[PDB]
């Protein structure tokens, strides 16, 4: 019960979502033939969270993926895990979004898009029930930025009653790789803001921040990546499939993170990740793990956090470990960084518990904190943009398929004004 | 007897100029490629965490 | 379900064209007979013939029959079409009017016959690559009016011109600078992209690397053939991150008009003495950027950068790309435009290059390439300014463009239009 | 330019030649490869044959040459569908997005390789609860 | 079994006739003697079509050659193949025809007629279950259009029940072979309107079109020509000799493409016919074919079929090919041609599959099209007439043998008929 469904687009997050569910598959027991081959009852228990049944006994992932070209879903078809996925799911165009937002949100995926709804629309009613949408894509890419943001509209458009998670790299300026990045990741960003439950960055800058600071090994490929962002999504959704002490689903996790409507935008961190020359020395201890899943290091975001005091913070302690710990560690540690926590608000940290740990390891906690900090990225997006647009370069393009200047000031001035109403409670005082 | 000029076994006409070094001839032969490395690749991608042990 | 049309056009498109198919045809491993002696990566420039050999996607189109019938009569002459190599009779005699308003019309129109032949077999068309050398008159004619033809025919597809343009101090005819204005101004106002490849240059890149001092055309052509290699090695071969054609002046034209870029190729060390540099990437690119890798006669120090799209082909990891990025802008010899903070497009692919038997080049496991856009590019534009404002002050050989059918304010009018993209340059650098 | 009638013994480049030397039964096809392809004199001390094109001889039914057009061009649909339960082979042709043949399909050893590697290889469940 | 007769008259009808019998000799696998070396048993179930049996197993054609001089008749068995035509009254004459239709149709030919009528009584009976007559002669020659002509009459005062079938070439203006040429063609046409229920036209000016400007060689000589005439004519008859999905005979076609009792004139043509130079880089499937056939160049008739409209079209498709592409591509050259093909009619394209494609190729097509555009090939013929009678040149030969210009203009009389009747339907709506 409470089941839900998975539509990812672009080829970012066709890659990730190819990597989480041969994550999930690997934490269940599914092989890749689809039959069963798990040991313990409760690895079967909850296979409603992400698994439909065909006629057979074998068992397929509840995934639709789109993507305007075929180059991408067609390599990510033939490797391992290829063959769960349901082709008739499959859906994609011939032409290519070109990252433009014009292409990919006016002219080519309004026609594109009847055949992904309807598949979405049967995919949902098919089962018993819904509980959220959870979206995977890009904003700095041309077809995801477009496709995914109208496909949420809709989707939100046609369902009111159900929430929605979202989780789309941002581009730090750093490392870049598209040189109109800036405007599409700006207009994305206003489309969501607006009609977006949740979302949850993750900034592939502190991404090659830890995996080169923490693991220690030197040349880490994109799989590394692709599976931390993975295990990281795992760490939100073990609990609506596991049981335990206390159970929290995706609602409980909005009702306990989101003070406010316009504030719907968190960066996660995922802990433990022990260098292959020490895991054998480190030692796994409760206050080890808080101390780290506090550390500043281990979130998946560059920007700073202490910059700024956390609004609130929640964790989803996985593994066994006794109740009193953890209270006991949050206590200490809220007395101890009072001024990085607000005042207004006490008693500012969520737990939670789940028995079953994850694959091989005792003790794994994610971290999700919404912090005044995360004015950064978009200070620093709006600061490229500004100057990017004083002098409409590459302005003709996004003008010569029917969008016009002002759509622009409309999403410029959508996002200033949430970096302002962000702002505002940091100097907030009681 | 004529390429001897210090002309003809330097300047050639069509290729490159012959100045004769010797390969080691165990290797360059089949396919050897240059470069300093063939960016050696590790130990584990996965594995590193999820230790399986 | 992607296909590119090859259109050239003069002899310089032509044996330029030569050469590269032999690039080509190795790449894949289609011997000449056509057949495969023993993984849908051959769809993107070759078309299957239902059973058997294949047959390139491209039409060539001359004036003069000799260098076309030795095509028809090389070591290659078992691939194209035998009804593909359109010819004509009378050769255009470097009087560009000939090409475009007396002669070329005859043979413009059957152009278009075969050309529609081949995209209805194709099914998904992405675009078209156009060589025309402006130094080379039969080209010249025939390049700029085709570029009007297909736009009207076609419509929104985009294109880009392999030009070959005059050297500022070399020069191979008298009369060079006054088909390359006529014809500069017929590629402006219809080409989305063009490519720099003043010949100069290339005997530059010659010398310094593989220490050649006969260098013969084959030679030159050889180091283009793998340039566009370069540009099309993600279009067929499976990658980490793919750029496509579309994606090219998505990232590459700051404005409508200002439409040109300069493009460099390296590593370029060949088995004489390569294996005693490292050719790591970091190392790699830092050539890139050199002056002496400019494939054309510029200098980028004389002016700011606006965008950059730099592609690399090999086993480089993606990580050692980004430190790459580091460095170069620390740098302080390169300055960027103001107004294009981050500009760098990167491109990566996995199948390394290949190597043509008995050529100069050596098999490196790196290879970089890179189309970069410039403000320098105003130098070349410039500096022919001189040579068509001595010239006509005296109106030298004009009186062989008046009775050929072209009117003679058509030179006027062509002044212009060099001087108004000279003066937008300038206007684009300025800091706001 | 208009097509000129033939006057010049076919080997020049006039006009309706490459046609025209495309057939076998002629002479001129089949030159000598010293004949032009020569670098020099001495090189190669004398000539060679390559032969010219490969094309049938009369010009209608150009597919001869070829053993596989022989082999199937005498069969009949109903000898091709109905022959037998026993080893009949399905032969339409599907999409090739259905038939991609996935890598694991591909090489069935790395099939079996996986799973014990992987699946059920030293898991934790000893769940804290009252009744387990 | 159905089987058929041919019967050829005049050097031309002779010179075809000698070639279609070759290329039959071959498919089946008879050699120049008649010894069975083909190698399936495709060949010898229907071989009974055109070839009889006799002892010592030599398969000797049932054909008829009859010409008023014996030059021609020397030559056929003079050439390869030769030795398979039965030496048996085996009608010749010995006073020539010399291009007068009079003097081949009443003194002359009578004389002889009459022995020839017996033979062809006797060989058409040796069939079963007879199918009909097909004769090939030439309307410009004497000996064919005259003496030819008076043998069709007689067949069918006694065999009303069998169809027959001609093989017609008429001369073309552009080209000259005779000068008293127009005369003998149009006292012919009015002879064969009345008794021969179908006619197909062959232009022998016509026949280097495909030749010189698709087949591109450069001296092609009368044995080339052959080869066309002979490439379609084998073809009309390609379910009358091996399986298929769809057998169509030929009174089908009569039935098929015979709307009205007069306006039995067709026009055929082959495909594909490609030169020595691209013979291999062309694709044959159903989509390239189906463009080639009504390519206004392609057909073997001198009349242009774009100067009207077509009311009634047979394809005869050979070789193993999906029918539903058949199919597809009729209805889709229908629509896109629909300015081509009367109104009141619909649907007026028939398909036909065959089992086995020529020796040597893929896939065929035969076309046999009735247009009301031939009418453009007798108004030439006929405006030559008008203009060369009112001065009675050469009136006076034919009027040596007792034929009397009261039937000439009775002929003339019916000639106009034809192209006007044949003409008010090219734009009459119902
Ligand atoms: N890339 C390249 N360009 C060449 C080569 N040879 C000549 N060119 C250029 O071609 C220009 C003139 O055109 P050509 O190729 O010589 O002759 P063409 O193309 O037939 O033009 P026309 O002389 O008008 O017939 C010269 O200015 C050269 O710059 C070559 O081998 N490679
Ligand atoms: N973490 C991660 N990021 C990726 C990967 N591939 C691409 N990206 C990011 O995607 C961004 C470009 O998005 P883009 O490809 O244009 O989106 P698209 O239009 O849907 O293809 C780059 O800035 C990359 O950082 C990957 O494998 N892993
Ligand atoms: N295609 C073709 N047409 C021929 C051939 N021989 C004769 N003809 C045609 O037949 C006409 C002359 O016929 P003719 O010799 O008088 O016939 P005859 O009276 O029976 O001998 C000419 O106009 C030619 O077009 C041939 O071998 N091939
Ligand atoms: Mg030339
Ligand atoms: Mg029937």
């Known amino acids: 019960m409470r089941e839900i469904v998975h539509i990812q687009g672009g080829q970012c997050g066709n890659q990730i979502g190819a990597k989480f569910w041969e994550v999930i598959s690997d934490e269940h027991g599914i092989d890749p033939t689809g039959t069963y081959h798990g040991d313990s ?20 992932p509840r995934a639709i993926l789109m993507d305007l070209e075929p180059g991408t879903m067609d390599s990510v078809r033939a490797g391992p895990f290829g063959q769960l996925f349901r082709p008739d799911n499959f859906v994609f165009g011939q032409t290519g979004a070109g990252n433009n937002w014009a292409k990919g949100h006016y002219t080519e995926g309004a026609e594109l898009i009847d055949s992904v709804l309807d598949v979405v629309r049967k995919e949902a009613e098919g089962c018993d029930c819904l509980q959220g949408f959870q979206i995977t894509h890009s904003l700095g890419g041309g077809t995801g930025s477009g496709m995914g943001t109208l496909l949420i509209s809709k989707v939100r458009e046609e369902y009111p009653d159900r929430i929605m998670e979202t989780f789309s790299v941002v581009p730090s300026p750093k490392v870049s790789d598209t040189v109109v990045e800036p405007y599409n990741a700006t207009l994305s960003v206003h489309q969501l803001v607006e009609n977006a439950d949740e979302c949850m960055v993750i900034d592939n800058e502190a991404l090659y921040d830890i995996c080169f600071r923490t693991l220690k090994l030197t040349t880490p490929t994109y799989g590394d990546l692709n599976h931390l962002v993975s295990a990281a999504m795992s760490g939100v959704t073990c609990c609506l499939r596991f049981p335990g002490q206390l159970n929290s689903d995706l609602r409980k996790l909005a009702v306990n993170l989101i003070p406010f409507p316009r504030l719907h935008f968190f960066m996660i961190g995922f802990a433990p990740l022990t260098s292959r020359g020490s895991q054998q020395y480190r030692a796994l201890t409760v206050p080890e793990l808080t ?60 737990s939670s518990i789940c028995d079953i740990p994850p694959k091989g390891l005792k003790m794994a906690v994610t971290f999700v904190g919404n912090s005044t900090a995360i004015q950064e990225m978009f200070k620093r997006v709006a600061e490229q943009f500004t100057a990017m647009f004083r002098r409409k370069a590459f302005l003709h393009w996004y003008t010569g398929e029917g969008m016009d200047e002002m759509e622009f000031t409309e999403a410029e001035s959508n996002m200033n004004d949430l970096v302002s109403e962000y702002q505002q409670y940091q100097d907030a005082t009681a | 007897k004529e390429a001897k000029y210090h002309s003809r076994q330097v300047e050639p006409l069509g290729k490159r100029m012959e100045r004769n070094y010797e390969f080691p001839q165990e290797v360059h032969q089949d396919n050897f490629k240059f470069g300093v490395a063939t960016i050696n690749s590790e130990n584990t991608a996965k594995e590193v965490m999820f230790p399986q042990k | 379900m992607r296909e590119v049309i090859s259109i050239h056009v003069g002899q310089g498109g032509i044996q330029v064209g030569n050469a590269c198919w032999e690039l080509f045809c190795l790449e ?100 078209f690559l156009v060589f025309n050398s402006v130094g080379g008159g039969t080209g010249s004619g025939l390049g700029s009016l085709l570029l009007e033809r297909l736009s009207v025919d076609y419509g929104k597809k985009s294109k880009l011109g392999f030009t070959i343009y005059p050297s500022p101090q070399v020069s191979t005819a008298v009369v060079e600078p006054y088909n390359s204005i006529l014809s500069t101004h017929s590629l402006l106002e219809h080409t989305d992209v063009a490519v720099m490849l003043d010949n100069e240059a290339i005997y530059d890149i010659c010398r310094r690397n593989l220490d050649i001092e006969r260098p013969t055309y084959t030679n030159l052509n050889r180091l283009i053939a793998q340039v566009i290699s370069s540009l099309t090695a993600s279009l067929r071969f499976d990658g980490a991150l793919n750029v496509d054609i579309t994606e090219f002046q998505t990232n590459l034209v700051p404005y409508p008009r200002i439409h040109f870029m300069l493009s460099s190729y390296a590593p370029i060390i060949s088995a004489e003495k390569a294996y005693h540099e490292q050719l790591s990437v970091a190392e790699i690119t830092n050539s890139a950027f050199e002056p002496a890798n400019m494939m054309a006669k510029c200098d980028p120090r004389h002016g700011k950068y606006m965008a950059c799209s730099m592609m690399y082909r090999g086993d480089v990891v993606p990580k050692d790309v980004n430190a790459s990025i580091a460095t170069i802008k620390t740098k302080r010899t390169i ?50 300014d001189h040579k068509f404002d001595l010239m006509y002050a005296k109106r030298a050989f004009v009186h062989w463009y008046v009775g050929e059918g072209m009117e003679e304010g058509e030179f006027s009018e062509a002044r212009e239009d060099l001087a108004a993209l000279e003066k937008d340059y300038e206007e684009v650098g300025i800091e706001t | 330019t208009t097509e000129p009638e033939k006057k010049f013994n076919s080997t020049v480049l006039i006009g309706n030649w490459y046609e025209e030397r495309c057939d076998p039964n002629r002479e001129q096809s089949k030159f000598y490869n010293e004949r032009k392809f020569a670098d020099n004199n001495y090189q190669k001390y004398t000539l060679s044959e390559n032969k010219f094109q490969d094309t049938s001889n009369s010009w209608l039914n150009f597919q001869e040459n070829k053993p596989e057009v022989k082999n199937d061009q005498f069969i009949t649909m109903n000898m091709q569908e109905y022959k037998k339960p026993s080893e009949q082979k399905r032969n339409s042709e599907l999409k090739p997005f259905i038939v991609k043949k996935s890598h694991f399909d591909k090489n069935p050893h790395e099939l079996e390789e996986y799973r014990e590697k992987w699946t059920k290889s030293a898991h934790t469940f000893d769940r804290m609860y009252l009744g387990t």
């Open chain 1, 41 to 60: 009852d409760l690895q079967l228990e909850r296979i409603n969270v992400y698994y439909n049944e065909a006629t057979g006994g074998r068992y397929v």
């Open chain 1, 291 to 350: 101390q780290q899943m506090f550390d500043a290091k281990n979130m998946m975001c560059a920007a700073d956090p202490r910059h700024g005091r956390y609004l609130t913070a929640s964790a989803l302690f996985r593994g066994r470990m006794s109740t009193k710990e953890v209270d006991e560690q949050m206590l200490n540690v809220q007395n101890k960084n009072s001024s990085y926590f607000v005042e207004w608000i006490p008693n500012n940290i969520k």
């Open chain 3, 28 to 127: 894949h491993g289609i011997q000449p007979d056509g057949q495969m002696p023993s993984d849908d990566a051959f769809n993107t420039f070759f078309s299957e013939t239902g059973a058997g050999k294949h047959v390139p996607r491209a039409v060539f189109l001359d004036l003069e029959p000799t260098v076309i019938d030795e095509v028809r009569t090389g070591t290659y002459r078992q691939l194209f079409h035998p009804e593909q190599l359109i010819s004509g009779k009378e050769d255009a005699a470097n009087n560009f009017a000939r090409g475009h308003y007396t002669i070329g019309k005859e043979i413009v129109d059957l152009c278009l016959d075969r050309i529609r032949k081949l995209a209805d077999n194709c099914t998904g068309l992405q675009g």
């Open chain 3, 335 to 384: 300055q960027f435009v103001d107004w294009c903070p981050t500009g760098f497009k990167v491109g990566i692919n996995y199948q390394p290059p290949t190597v043509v038997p008995g050529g100069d080049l050596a098999k490196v496991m790196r290879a970089v390439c890179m189309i970069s856009n410039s403000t320098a590019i105003a130098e070349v534009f410039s500096r022919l």
